[PDB]
Amino acid sequence: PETLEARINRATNPLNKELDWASINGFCEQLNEDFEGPPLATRLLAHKIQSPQEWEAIQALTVLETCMKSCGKRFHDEVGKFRFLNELIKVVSPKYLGSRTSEKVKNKILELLYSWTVGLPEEVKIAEAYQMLKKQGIVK
């Protein structure tokens, strides 16, 4: 059994030839193991997602997506804070990272946010983020 660090580094390795579902799923499994796991997972995801290396970021978005699909209040709540949402907003915003982020990564972020507004309506700050992105013209 490895740290969240080691697991995320496997699951998002630029050298991976395809999605590493063993390491992705094991990351989701492990983040709930102790009390502070989920906030750590979200810290680690946010950094990976801001990678200038597209495949590193795309894999990390797939991790995010996968863990969000499964039951877990603490992780749902961490992702549903601006402390994490803001890291996503920076990737799609031209005033932060948006100008040198591929449209693939940016569109994926927008697609996921929408999906959470529908699938997790209790995380109201995700909807607030998404409505801001519409008002500012990022969506679309």
């Binding site: 804070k81 907003i89 799609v92 915003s93 005033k95 932060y96 983020a129 992105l133 500012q136 990022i138």
Partner: peptide
């Protein structure tokens, strides 16, 4: 939350 303010894109 204790959360931070939303950044505007």
């Amino acid at each position: 939350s204790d959360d931070v303010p939303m950044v505007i894109a």
